[model samples]
Target chain A: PVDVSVSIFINKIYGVNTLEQTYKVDGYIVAQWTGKPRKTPGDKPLIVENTQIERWINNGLWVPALEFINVVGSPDTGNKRLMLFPDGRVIYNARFLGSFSNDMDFRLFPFDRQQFVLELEPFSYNNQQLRFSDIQVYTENIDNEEIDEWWIRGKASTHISDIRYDHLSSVQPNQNEFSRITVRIDAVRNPSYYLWSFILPLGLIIAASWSVFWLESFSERLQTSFTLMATVVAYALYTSNILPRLPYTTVIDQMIIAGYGSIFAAILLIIFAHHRQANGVEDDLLIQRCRLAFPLGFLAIGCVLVI
Target chain B: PVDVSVSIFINKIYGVNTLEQTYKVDGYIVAQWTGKPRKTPGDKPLIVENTQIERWINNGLWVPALEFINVVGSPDTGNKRLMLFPDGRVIYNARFLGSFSNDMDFRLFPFDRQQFVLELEPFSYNNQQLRFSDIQVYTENIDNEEIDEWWIRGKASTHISDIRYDHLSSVQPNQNEFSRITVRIDAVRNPSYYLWSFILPLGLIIAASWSVFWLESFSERLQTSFTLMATVVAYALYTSNILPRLPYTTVIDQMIIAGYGSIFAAILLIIFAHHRQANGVEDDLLIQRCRLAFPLGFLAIGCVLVI
Candidate 1:
């Protein structure tokens, strides 16, 4: 048996899939050794394809299973990797698609960032023995990178940890010893065309919601509210066109509900300013103030939606 | 050597996919023939798997390629059939997955009805003529069937025809005598959740647009129109959420555009009625009349839309 020192440098990791059970990864694995290395059949690294890599994994091969630590959704395992070199330097570089676990609240969706992570560990080994003895991370900053699907732009930051998997294979019974390597990624919104075209305009409409209060008549304000409610319903239909059909409401949905409230609040105050309190003066200062109060109330509701 | 009178009864046919070049079909194929009146093989039909069926098709055995006339997306080629009879009569019924072609215009989409069709033709010789055919259109009244990403509710009334394929294989270079079979299916609206949730609501918003004229004051009407514009925008966002992402607009899209126009029209009238005329009294009557005119105008617009 040969002792191998493996160091994984993940340049960029992204693509989290739920149905296919996979995540896509692009990185370099550096396997360097200090022992007096003997010459092998070849002087260069060996190339392994899809089937060969899987064979190596199933045969109790010393391939460490790398994972995304902060993945948004569970990903599918894509390409496998195993690299061997002549001068005691072997690096496994393969496009890995893996399923990762994460707690996602896409209520705010396009307006929020879902953390992407990669978790890596020895498939069958315990932490103490096969632990990544001296692991170094060279994470690149992702903010300024080419914002396509997902990629790395610069040296953002990095961290090292020893993770344990409680769920172990039944075939490898009592073997809970595994070394974990995690890579964290912060992904921006998908901006699926429907989102930008529909959502941005909607936000603009809601922003101008305060103007509805500026209307100057009791009947005018009251009737306009119906239009406002109608607008909300229309907007609801528009939202239905682009969003994924789901049983639960998301963050944007809540914001839309808030919009209806703001407009309705204006309607209520507009009606109340004239009818209640027999001032007979018709100049209702209290009603106008209600309009002013709603803007702040909207802000308060807006602050907590960290979708 | 032997003659098999083939009759195919196509069931519900819908779901035609253009990009993938596929069509969906649900039907039965019967290949009846008079054998030497020998003993039965098993007193039952033999169901062959996919592999063996293709083998039989390639090995000089005759399997006519049948097409679905009316399918929305392409057929996924799910179940297959190969039935054999013990007596002198032999009936073969096999389900098939196939690609089909048809003219489709999703311009109206949710409010549109696009026909699904398939053109089936003999592979080689037209010497073997089709017998009088009867089709079964049982999909239309499928109350118990579950809804899916695509639904084949009550199928369109089915139609069968004798047609021919212009293209030919190398084996039959000049075989222009091939008979063609055309299957047609008419499908109704599924009212995809998005359409009902997004589109119908948007229409209601646009339709009620004429109500903007009922306001009492100029500023109330003018500024509110802008908010109405924003409301349309918001509705657009909502529409985007429910509909599939597409590069171009559809019939419902035109309705959204119309909503924008109505609000903008109101904006112009609101502003012009206040600022333009002499003494503004000349406009008071006009503005008030606009209250009823726009509603009627919107009705006119609705009538024109149908045309």
Candidate 2:
């Protein structure tokens, strides 16, 4: 049984997909395992390059196939090397580009925190031999925070565990346990772009919608209110064109819904003030002036949706 | 190096992503090549299963790596098999699920006809020995049409050619050529859901926005116009919430801008009718009645945007 110690150096994490629940990670993977000592061409460790690695593979070298269980597709391998030490140790290092699968809950959306994960295990090896006994994660320190969309928090987390598959086609079902290495990196989205670009503009448009109540004549008020309604809808379309498409509603989606609801409520109130007068109180000035109360009131309501 | 004739059987093609310019394809790949005849246990051909195939790999079997050049991530491979014939022929078959990279033009979006493509090339072998001399496509046996978002137009297209890489690390530039197999499947999106769900509701909202001109009082006309604007914005938000997001403007986005433009024009005209009476022209009734002219005029203008 060979014990492989794996190390992952995460260089960059980008292209986070909300709909597909996937994230792209670019990094290097290193696996070290002790083997029988071999005499090198020189006294130093033997470094086998790409074509030479194939030659070594043809010469009965035991290169284990380590598969990413949560990877969307196969990882694009960059430079690969096999380092053979004179002291009876072998190391395999490779750069990879992989789109990993994760269960991302984007209901909070713009303000949500997410953990990007990676699960690595041997393709056909059991835990008895070829075990992933240790793992270490090395993530790059954030120097310039403003340049990227996701702000990674703290150091990377690593875990080594045994995963048992009951559904495997095996003569002995109890022997289907495999050693696994799990790595996780927590990150928070920098919502400044969405806040300044999407929410603020939408808020301004919705606030401008309240000005229709201040108009003098009933015809002017009613006609201008329709324009306000169209403005809200146009803003909705603009935001939709910009934001990610998701199956469930996000915080921004709920805000947009609130914008629609507020405008529709204004329409109902506008018609009510003009038509639904009680006690012969001509021109419900008090109710029409309630537009002033909605700005902060709607903001308070928006704050309640932080899930 | 040996001449390899490849065949692809496309099973399913779906999940067309607009923003990332990607698509998912599930298919089976077969590669056949002639080799020196070998003796088998029986008089018939030898059937080596998965475990036996790895055993053969450990014994230095020459298996060429065929890679998908434009694949975004590594393909999810399933059910790999090796068929060794007594007549010096070897066949490798494997099922793969991959998200491939393609240059997709969604400018016509809802009415777009696209060709999903797959490019396969020998990773380390040159065209001289690992030549992809011929390719056969067998995707004509599709039984389910309505289940998929896209409708396959015809039989799949196949081409075997030599591809040159300009960015390879080589001393001789001309020696960087490799044998490649290209597969294409033409399809058209089923735009029924988008039409009925997105465009229809937006049209109704825009139509409702025009009713602002029908109110009797100037205050009512102007006030309702604001509501019309807000309504357009609201509908825009709703549509944005449901539809796929694109970098550039789509037909629906253009319609949204048109809705905003029409409402803004109505607001200006309503205000001008009350305020801008040039040389005592008495209420500009002709322009106020332009609301009656716009319902069909907007519809006509909308039809011109079918491209």
Candidate 3:
């Protein structure tokens, strides 16, 4: 079995899609392996470029194809070259651009941390024929955190493992174990823009809705509650249009719902204060002062939701 | 007079600040001019690097210092080189990082298109000594628009102009006019995030506030208008915190004030509808149904603000 050491230089990682569950990456991939020593004119290294690469392969060179298991489709391949050392070493390098699939969890949205990955496995060779010995990856980290949409974290994690297929013609243990290389990148969403632009303002809107209680007259209190309800509806509609569609509500969405619920409860209490009276429909000063109560209550309820 | 042709290669443009009126840029600068023919190694071009560049300057090489008029401070210089041709052409190249000042108007914010510029001129010489003949600029445009904070337009426009110093020792015509090279890069804010996240939702909040009039009771109507009023106050407070401090209100700010006005108008009408009656507090049906009137009136008022 031949053990191949893979090194990938990822220049850029962008176009992260939350709904489609994909990301676009452009980089250079290098696979280096040891082979039987071959005769060379002066024992110097032989360098092969794009066209000469195929000619060397046809002349009895054993080059295995590594498939990207999570890639959406075939990659857009760029430069390809090979370096042949007289001392039984071969290095194959290729540049590629492709959309890779991965699981993305954006429940926290702007504050969410994500893990992007690459999965590589031998196309036709099992662990008995070819195996991955080591793997490593590199990424470009530059500029202020506010400039880019995603901020790449430090050195990515790499692992080499063996995968066994159950229904491969009732495969034996030796034939079923396929060598695999997984490169995982840890990153964070650039949240400054969202914090100042989206999150902060939304909180102000919800907290501001609590002011509906400060209105002196009972009619003023009840009427104001309706406007607060409408405000939440408008914000929810805006959020739905702006944010990518998801199966469940994001933290922002939950906050918006909280705004909706708090205002509705205010509407009920504003009406209840006057009706549950001894003589006539009169304003309840104590109930009105609960203005301080709901804000803290909503904040408390919000704390519990995250946990 | 020596005519210098400047070529700037701007690799990245980021860290745009609205309040400070500044932007950070990283790139390489190339200044080329013709000099008296000098003897070289077998008449071949001479390429001198960092240390050797100063040595050449000391050895009768005339290298002019070009100052960036808008650069906030001294730039962080990287690689420096001198390329001399046997045909009397000298090419000076240097890599630099600096924050440049410019006139930035963010009244439109996310939808605002901006122009970033660099002004280069000889420090000591006027047009009579060292004049800029022509200039050009370059920038990198790549990946999905969503990934970047700003979108640079096509090839930047560059120009050579003359600047006069009125307070410079009562200078003559030839001594007063200084040659300047101006490179202007046109770009637009990547507004998708703000559109989905900021602008669109704010509009939703405003429009939703209008729904308060749809309530049945006059008490419900009067009370609801206060909530809409509170909603606008909340949004205004939110905008003030999230957005950069400006001399005047933005379109968003105006919209918020308009919201305040609309709710106030509704409050007056709701109170007027009950009191201005034949006998006791009786409702005015026509004024109450003016629910459709205010939304259109606010939209009309908004149109005037941008103009």
Highest TM-score among the candidates is held by which one? Answer: 2
**Candidate 3 or 1, higher lDDT:** 3
TM-score-wise, the better of 2 and 3 is 2
Candidate 1 lDDT tens digits, A1-307: 2344556555445555421223555555544433334355666656666678656444433344333333322234345455555554445555434334443434455554566555544322343333343333444444444445544322323344555434222224454544555545555554555366866777787877777677775665666676666666676676665454532345666666666666656654665576566665374766665666767777766776533
The candidates' DockQ values read: 0.07, 0.16, 0.03
| Worst 10 contiguous positions by lDDT, candidate 3 chain A | A165-174
lDDT, model 3: 0.71
TM-scores of the models, in the given order?
0.48, 0.60, 0.55
Query: Which ranges in model 3 have alpha carbons more than 4 Å from their true place?
Result: A1-307, B39-43, B127-143, B170-173, B303-307
- Count clashing residue pairs per candidate: 87, 66, 5
lDDT of 1 at A140: 41
* Worst-scoring 10-residue span by lDDT in model 2 chain B: B132-141
Q: What lDDT score is found at residue A230 in candidate 3?
A: 58
Ranking by lDDT: 2, 3, 1
Q: How good is the docking of model 3, as DockQ? A: 0.03
lDDT of each: 0.53, 0.72, 0.71
Relative to the true structure, candidate 1 reaches a TM of 0.48
